[PDB]
Structures are given as C-alpha cells and as structure tokens.
Design a binder for this molecule. Sequence first.
Ligand SMILES: NC(=O)c1ccc[n+]([C@@H]2O[C@H](COP(=O)([O-])OP(=O)(O)OC[C@H]3O[C@@H](n4cnc5c(N)ncnc54)[C@H](O)[C@@H]3O)[C@@H](O)[C@H]2O)c1
Ligand SMILES: Cc1cc(NC(=O)NCCC(=O)Nc2ccncc2)no1
Length: 344
Amino acid sequence: AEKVLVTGGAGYIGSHTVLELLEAGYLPVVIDNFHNAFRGGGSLPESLRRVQELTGRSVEFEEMDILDQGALQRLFKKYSFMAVIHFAGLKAVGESVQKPLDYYRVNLTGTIQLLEIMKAHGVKNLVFSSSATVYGNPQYLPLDEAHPTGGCTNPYGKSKFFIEEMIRDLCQADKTWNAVLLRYFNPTGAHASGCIGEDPQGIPNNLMPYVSQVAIGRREALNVFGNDYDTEDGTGVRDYIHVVDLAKGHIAALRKLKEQCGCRIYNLGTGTGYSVLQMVQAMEKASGKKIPYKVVARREGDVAACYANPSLAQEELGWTAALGLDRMCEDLWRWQKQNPSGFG
Ligand SMILES: NC(=O)c1ccc[n+]([C@@H]2O[C@H](COP(=O)([O-])OP(=O)(O)OC[C@H]3O[C@@H](n4cnc5c(N)ncnc54)[C@H](O)[C@@H]3O)[C@@H](O)[C@H]2O)c1
Ligand SMILES: Cc1cc(NC(=O)NCCC(=O)Nc2ccncc2)no1
C-alpha cells in the first residue's frame, strides 16, 4: 500500500484534492500546521472530517510544520509514499509585501527541506501547486507555457518562481525525478455538496470572497478598482477556476508522473477571463441578491487583463475544466448558505 503525501491538505485547494484522491483510488496522508485551517472537535481538521463523510473513506493526518526537519524525517520513515502533492505555504499576495521574510522562509526553506527528505527516502515524484503570477505582467494573451517567467511584482510570486527554478535544477541533475508544476490563478466555488469550501480569509487574492460577503449582508458595497481599462466593459479581467476542476487537475498531474515524464509545466484554467462586472452579475444571478458596487481609482500596478491558456494540459494531461462562471457562483453560494461563517 503506497500512499500520497498531501502537504497543506487541510486548506482550501488541499481539502478538495484529498477528496479527489480518495475518489480516484489513492490513499492520502495529510500534514498541516493549522496556520490557515480550522480544527475539528476531534483529531482531524473539520474539512477532512467532512471529506471522510462525503467519501466513506479514511484520511490519515499528522499535525506538523514543514519547517521541522525532525518531524519530516520521522514522517517519511512511518509512511511509505509513492508521491507528494505540495500545497503547504503562505499565499496572500498583499501580506507578502508587508512580511516578505515570512514568505521566503515558509515557502523556500519549507520546500527545500521537503525535497531533501524526499530524496533521502527515494520518493522522487512531485506535484507542485504553483501560481500563474510567475509570468509577471502579461506580454501577450492568453498566457501560455512559452511566456517569459520571473518578472514578478511581489514576494509571493517571486517565492513561487524561485521554487519552480529549484525543482527544474533538481530534475536536470537527476533525470529519474518526475515533477509536474501547475500554474493557475484564482480558485473559487466549492464542492457541490456545499459541505466544504474556502474558510474566511484575512487577505484575499481575488474579489469573490468580498462579493460573497456583500451578497449575505456583511459588507455594504464592492469596491471596483478602475473602470477605464482596455477591456470590453472597462473593469479588470481576471482568471477564475472552479476548485473542483483544479483539484482534478492535480490528480491528472499525479497520473502523469507514472509515465516517467521528468519535469513538466502546465497551466490550468477555463481559458476565458471574466471582468469584475461579469462576476458581480453572475453572483447576483446565483444568489438572487443585489450586489451594490462603487467605482474607485485603479490600484497602482494592476493590469487590464490576465488569464491562462490551458491547451497544453488538454493535450498532455487529458484534462479540461468543465465548470463555468455560473456554476462557480452557484457552488460558492451553496457553501455560504450552509456554512455562513465557514467551518466555525
Ligand atoms: N488561493 C490562491 O489564490 C492560490 C493561487 C495559486 C496557487 N496557490 C497555491 O496553493 C497552495 C494552497 O492554496 P490554498 O488556497 O488552498 O491555501 P490555504 O491557506 O487554504 O492552504 C494551505 C495550507 O497550508 C498550511 N500550511 C501553511 N504553512 C504551513 C507549514 N509551515 N507547515 C504545514 N502546513 C502549513 C495552512 O495551514 C493551510 O491549511 C499554496 O501552494 C499556494 O501558493 C493558491
Ligand atoms: C481587478 C479588480 C478587483 C477589484 N475589486 C476588488 O477586488 N474588491 C474587493 C475588495 C474591496 O472591495 N475592498 C474594500 C471595499 C470597501 N472598503 C474597503 C475595502 N476591482 O478590480
């Protein structure tokens, strides 16, 4: 019985991916330090306790920090892993500008320690959950895997790019390593049960949490940062992927490892961007509520449009996103109605 290690598996994308692993016939072991996840009333995170109910299957779980070398060494002795899916990290773009050293420590030192322990136990199969912010500001659209990387505008994006480079160098040095790097933008929606979803976040990377709070009556109006961009309706165009489609993409990457693929890089996305006004309109339709907005000045450094081309993932992973904007909103709204303050 070889297992799949999911780091950061209590969090938003991780919990959905643990569910998809169980549905695809894998045996998951999760590690998390609860930096940004909710504890349940027993040993499991609440997200994972609910995953067990949804699937009828067990999730093994260890509370630990990826920065703890001794804890990681013990973990790889206790369990026999075939692969690792790596989500443990800090990910709030706005926070990374204020506290860059925390981002570099957790993301870079954590990942380096993970890679070293993997090597030491002969586990040379990795899915790395990257960010399409590694492309920097678009030079052409949609962004494909040939687009320049490294022009990054904030410490979070830099940390993701640096990790990618370290993995590419590892794979150059040892051709027996297989690693899939997945680049995407903004996860939204929730499992269709409504029982798991994104918990309330301190510093969101996208507008949908704010929109969801306006719709339930906890904020007055969405601030729209600029309506004079070179876009169809003047508001910013951004890339949103349903978290369930994203989680399935991570399973497709895991399967690709078995082909002895070496180092591969794929974008995940729907292939179409959505404006601020489109997102507002879709949530109004899903929720049946009015969502007031106020146009304010642009945020310094924002671009008109940014979205990814997912064509390579279709060709080489056999993967497409099936769930569109209306479904993202419907599934988000269901999670909010059933869990207005998240797991708490
Ligand atoms: N949410 C996004 O906007 C987005 C976009 C692109 C990529 N990502 C990537 O996805 C991953 C997770 O995203 P998410 O949105 O599910 O966030 P999340 O915060 O919900 O999940 C990350 C999990 O990692 C845990 N964690 C953090 N530091 C840890 C540490 N030192 N040791 C152990 N566990 C630790 C947190 O407690 C949390 O449960 C990260 O790799 C992130 O860079 C996120
Ligand atoms: C590309 C883009 C995004 C965007 N708007 C957005 O993300 N808004 C969410 C945050 C927000 O409204 N904050 C806020 C509101 C009121 N008082 C204080 C803070 N506009 O363009």
